[PDB]
Amino acid sequence: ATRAIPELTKLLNDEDQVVVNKAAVMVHQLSKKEASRHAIMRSPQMVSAIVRTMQNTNDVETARCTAGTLHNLSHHREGLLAIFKSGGIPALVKMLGSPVDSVLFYAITTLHNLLLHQEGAKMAVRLAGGLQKMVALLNKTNVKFLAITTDCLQILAYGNQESKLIILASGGPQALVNIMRTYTYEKLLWTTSRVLKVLSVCSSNKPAIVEAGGMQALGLHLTDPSQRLVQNCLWTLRNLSDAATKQEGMEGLLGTLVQLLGSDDINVVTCAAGILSNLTCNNYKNKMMVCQVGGIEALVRTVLRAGDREDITEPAICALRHLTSRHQEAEMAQNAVRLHYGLPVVVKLLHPPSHWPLIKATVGLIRNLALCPANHAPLREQGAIPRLVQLLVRAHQDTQRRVEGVRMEEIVEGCTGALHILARDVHNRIVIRGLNTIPLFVQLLYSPIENIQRVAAGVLCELAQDKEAAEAIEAEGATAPLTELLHSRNEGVATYAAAVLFRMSED
């Protein structure tokens, strides 16, 4: 056991075909005896000998045995410091090009233990070019092996933009996405989804993950019994979903997200809402699918249940706003919000304690709801108009005498746009006018921002259809600013402006 030792050193470090080969099969043996090995990491001349013969050999049993030893040695915090102080990291990495499975398994786990416990190991693996080597190993098929390799990658990539970009350039995204859609082994899907989460916050990795089919592959695991796997999939999907507008094959993912809205899990709900929010922006087919699988219903229930938790209601409200315009079933969806009892909660979200991003999204949603005639009356009855007017008046003041992510100019435009639509209904025009808004709408004709001039002249165009209001609009001196706006580069602006003028000068 203890005394007769650096014998096998000298024959290992030898320059002969048989000599070092059969000598290595020896340290191998003795490293297995737990308390016998805990003494063999002592010899710097011994430790480093192991390393060399591994780096340059031919023997599949030399290799196996050298690696397995380092493997075996990598369990004590003294056992690791030895491998490290010796410099096996670069050789171990070099062993990641080997074609012999057992050699792979031994290298990876040694690096793994080193990456896990040993000071300074992350930096030395990077220097050795391990990232590239680990990425190329992702095409293997042994799940235990792949689990370890993906975990090395997560350890290296976390908080290290340089490493994330090397992973990108080595084709990481595709190979990690392949893993997600091929395997079922939880431990492996989990660590892989962690690697994808870490990369999904990277400006360059994100579209590559999306181009590789990331969104669909991640979707596959959203009903796994493993909660840590589903959640990590939800976080990654969320980070990526603003880049996935152009993706097809999205129908399964979209249906699962709708079901996930009903979850008891707050992070689950929060994620699904935000993912549905992003994937529905502009892509009218996603709109179509989400509505076809009951999205409106589910989004209304989610908003009713969230109460004042803005992490939920804001993305849910943005999703409902996407879903209530500019697709073939926009109109059924505008109706469905009312039918599932959404109109009161949506008006309620305009009031404190709601913060600005929510108010903004909510106003946008009201705008859309108002395109549907049968919403005109309940919106009024729920009190939509006076709050939208107060929000407008206050936000316009803030813009003159000059917030939390949002510019008051957006609330001005949003509120005026919402009132423009609501003004289609005659009783609504009475409330709007009775709130003495005409002076304000006229001032908004002078705004620098064209979209504001558009909704302002549009709402005046709606109001000017009643005799009494046209007179009022004229008394505000609207003729002059409308005169100049006839020449706006914006056709909406120039057209609305001419309809007001027409309706005023029937005298």
Swiss-Prot record:
Modified-residue entries (S-nitrosocysteine), positions: C461
Positions where Phosphoserine occurs in the chain: S43, S98
Region: Interaction with BCL9, residue numbers: 8-30
Primary location class: cytoplasm
Compartments it resides in: Cytoplasm; Nucleus; Cytoplasm, Cytoskeleton; Cell junction, Adherens junction
Result of changing F502A: Abolishes CTNNBIP1 binding
Tissue spec: Expressed in several hair follicle cell types: basal and peripheral matrix cells, and cells of the outer and inner root sheaths. Expressed in colon. Present in cortical neurons (at protein level). Expressed in breast cancer tissues (at protein level).
Variant or mutagenesis effect after changing K144N: Found in a patient with features of osteopathia striata cranial sclerosis; uncertain significance; results in increased Wnt signaling
Recorded GO MF terms: alpha-catenin binding; cadherin binding; chromatin binding; disordered domain specific binding; DNA-binding transcription factor binding; enzyme binding; histone methyltransferase binding; I-SMAD binding
ARM repeat extents: 3-43, 45-86, 87-128, 129-170, 171-212, 213-241, 252-293, 294-336, 341-382, 383-413, 436-478, 479-507
Effect of K144A: Abolishes or strongly reduces AXIN1 and AXIN2 binding
Positions of post-translational Phosphotyrosine modification: Y183, Y185
Effect caused by changing H322A: Abolishes TCF7L2 binding, and strongly reduces or abolishes LEF1 binding
Phenotype when changing N278A: Abolishes TCF7L2 and LEF1 binding
Record's GO cellular component terms: adherens junction; apical part of cell; apicolateral plasma membrane; basolateral plasma membrane; beta-catenin destruction complex; beta-catenin-ICAT complex; beta-catenin-TCF complex; beta-catenin-TCF7L2 complex
Family statement drawn from the similarity comment of this UniProt entry: Belongs to the beta-catenin family.
Function statement: Key downstream component of the canonical Wnt signaling pathway. In the absence of Wnt, forms a complex with AXIN1, AXIN2, APC, CSNK1A1 and GSK3B that promotes phosphorylation on N-terminal Ser and Thr residues and ubiquitination of CTNNB1 via BTRC and its subsequent degradation by the proteasome. In the presence of Wnt ligand, CTNNB1 is not ubiquitinated and accumulates in the nucleus, where it acts as a coactivator for transcription factors of the TCF/LEF family, leading to activate Wnt responsive genes. Also acts as a coactivator for other transcription factors, such as NR5A2.
Disease: Colorectal cancer: A complex disease characterized by malignant lesions arising from the inner wall of the large intestine (the colon) and the rectum. Genetic alterations are often associated with progression from premalignant lesion (adenoma) to invasive adenocarcinoma. Risk factors for cancer of the colon and rectum include colon polyps, long-standing ulcerative colitis, and genetic family history. Activating mutations in CTNNB1 have oncogenic activity resulting in tumor development. Somatic mutations are found in various tumor types, including colon cancers, ovarian and prostate carcinomas, hepatoblastoma (HB), hepatocellular carcinoma (HCC). HBs are malignant embryonal tumors mainly affecting young children in the first three years of life.
Name of the featured protein: Catenin beta-1
Species of the source: Homo sapiens
Designated gene of the protein: CTNNB1
